[PDB]
Amino acid sequence: SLIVTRFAPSPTGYLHIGGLRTAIFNYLFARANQGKFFLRIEDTDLSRNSIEAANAIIEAFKWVGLEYDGEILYQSKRFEIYKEYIQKLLDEDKAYYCYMSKDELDALREEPPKGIEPVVRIKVPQNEVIGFNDGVKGEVKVNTNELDDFIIARSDGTPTYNFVVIVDDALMGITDVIRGDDHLSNTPKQIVLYKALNFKIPNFFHVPMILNEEGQKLSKRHGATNVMDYQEMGYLKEALVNFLVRLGWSYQDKEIFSMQELLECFDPKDLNSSPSCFSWHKLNWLNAHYLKNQSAQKLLELLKPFSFSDLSHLNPADRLLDALKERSQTLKELALKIDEVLIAPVEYEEKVFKKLNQALIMPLLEKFKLELKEANFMHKIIEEEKIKAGSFMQPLRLALLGKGGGIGLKEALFILGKTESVKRIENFLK
């Protein structure tokens, strides 16, 4: 069966994670059945603010990797198309000109003009039942008496969002629409427009909105709704998609999915009607997994915008990533731990430095400096001055790493250059 879906978001300044989730559902439905998936940008005006917003949505779309068929459709490039359908409804007396204000209509609905530019409103047939079988909620019915004559064209002639969606959906042959429960009230209004223009009504799937940790609606008050913020936070594109597709959808008790697995087992009949919650632990658990399943060369290219240290080390000097990969969850956390090893310490932790015998620690490091200088690149040496390991390992760690609980001293000596290790010990003695 041929499936034609799209992603036509309402005007936003960027790509929201909630909109990314909806775009994934619509994407997966088309790709699972070898259909077509489009991206439509609805710019109500050709201003500088809306041009940058469109580029931002396209930017996040490219980074995530959701490819679309054909070229991107813009609302500003289809101005004359929307005008003709609006005129058609007028000439058929299915739409009419209105000069009243909203406050006048609110009072009248509860009980040759000169100058004033009118708006165009659609004539909603009263005393009818608008119904549609939603793929998630089931049969949804609404009386037309609960729908007033809504605006389809403003006083300057510009069509509304609902009119632009249904025209573009009919001209593109959209067969299914997977939507969030937020826009559930716009669906009956779109159905009116569809029937008025004798257009085919695609199938609808209304999924619950994403909830936060406290069960509230996911909004800008949480502080992480822009998809490109997750890129700056250090999350991989594969982990972000795996996280969002799991909200409101579940297969067979599985948590990790590849792109080829989703494309071969996604089904909109499995969309859960129970709302899902946004979990930082779940997203980090996924992102830790995809980060650990990466290679070594790819990690070098991923860690470049996050690490202050340039990687000119040898293939074994991959040992740096072995110890930090398991203890890191994002590229930001991984690169920071890397900088804690490659970048030389500028200061020393006074919590452990002040509680150290300076008369005994200084000559002991020198005896090890020469003992290690004879060796090179991987068996280390142990001091034999009849002392515990802590009496020697704690000062050596402060000289090499400066902190209290970092990587093991055996790996840090090999990761760092044999000349760099001596340069750090000599700086500790100064």
DSSP 165-229: HHHHHHHTT--EEEEEGGGGTHHHHHHHHHHHTT----EEEEEPPPB-TTSPBP-TTTS--BHHH
| CATH 3.90.800.10 domain range(s) in the chain | 72-160
Distance CA 430, CA 422 (A): 13
Position 379: which residue type?
Answer: H
8 A C-beta contact, residue 118 and residue 155 = yes
Is the distance from CB of 122 to CB of 149 less than 8 angstroms? Answer: yes
The Cα 391–Cα 382 span in angstroms is: 12
> For residue 400, which of 376, 382, 426, 379 has the smallest C-alpha distance?
426
DSSP string, 324-370: HHTT-SSHHHHHHHHHHHHSPPSS--HHHHTTS-HHHHHHHHHHHHH
Q: Are 63 and 228 in contact (CB under 8 A)?
A: yes
CATH superfamily of 72-160: Glutamyl-tRNA Synthetase; Domain 3 (3.90.800.10)
Q: Judge contact between 2 and 176, C-beta under 8 A.
A: no
Structure tokens belonging to residue 35: 């259909």
Residues forming CATH 3.40.50.620 domain(s) in the chain: 1-71+161-211
Q: Is 223 left (phi over 0), alpha (psi -120 to 50) or beta?
A: left
- The rounded distance, in Å, linking the Cα atoms of 291 and 240 is 12
Instruction: Please report the DSSP string for 103-145 in residue order.
Output: HHHHHHHT----SPPPEEEE---SS-EEEEEETTTEEEEEEGG
Calpha distance 314→308 (Å, rounded):
18
Element (H, E) at 37: strand 36-41
Burial class (CB in 10 A: 0-12, 13-18, 19+), 247: buried
Alpha-carbon distance of 71 to 297, in angstroms, equals 33
Whole-number CA gyration radius for the chain:
31
CA-to-CA separations, 316 to 312, 394, 405, 412, in angstroms, rounded:
12, 26, 23, 12
Q: In this structure, are residues 376 and 418 in contact, taking their beta carbons and an 8 Å threshold? A: yes
Tokens of 254: 């599985």
Question: 297's torsion region: left (phi>0), alpha (psi -120 to 50) or beta?
Answer: alpha
Domain boundaries 1-71+161-211, CATH class:
alpha beta
3-state helix, strand, coil in the chain (%, to 5): 45, 10, 40
Torsion of CA 188, 193, 199, 202, to 10 degrees: -30
φ and ψ at residue 142, rounded to 5 degrees: -150, 135
Helix and strand numbers (H, E) in the chain are 18, 10
Q: Which two tokens stand for residue 426?
A: 């000599």
By the 8 A CB rule, do 158 and 76 touch?
no
At 422, which amino acid appears?
Answer: V
Residues of the chain with CATH 1.10.1160.10: 212-294
Pairing of strands 4-7, 36-41: parallel
| Residue 389 CB neighbour total at 10 angstroms | 9
Residue 287 · residue 264 · CB < 8 Å: no
Q: Do 96 and 65 contact (CB within 8 A), yes or no?
A: no
Whether residue 337 is annotated as binding a ligand: the answer is: no
Strands 36-41 and 73-74: parallel
d(CA 122, CA 149): 5
CATH topology of domain 212-294: Glutamyl-tRNA Synthetase; domain 2 (1.10.1160)
Resolution in A: 2.5
How many other CB atoms are found less than 10 A from the CB of residue 157?
Answer: 14
284 vs 14: CA distance, rounded Å: 23
Euclidean distance between CA atoms 27 and 229, whole angstroms: 22
Rounded distance, CA 396 to CA 390, Å? 10
- The secondary structure of residue 65, as a DSSP letter, is T
Please, what's the b/e burial string for 213-237 (b: 16 or more CB within 10 A of its CB; e: otherwise)? eeeeebeeeeeebbbeebbebbbbb
CA distance 381 to 67: 55
Spatial separation of the C-alpha atoms in residues 217 and 137, rounded to whole Å: 19
Instruction: Tell me which method was used to determine the 3D structure.
Output: X-ray
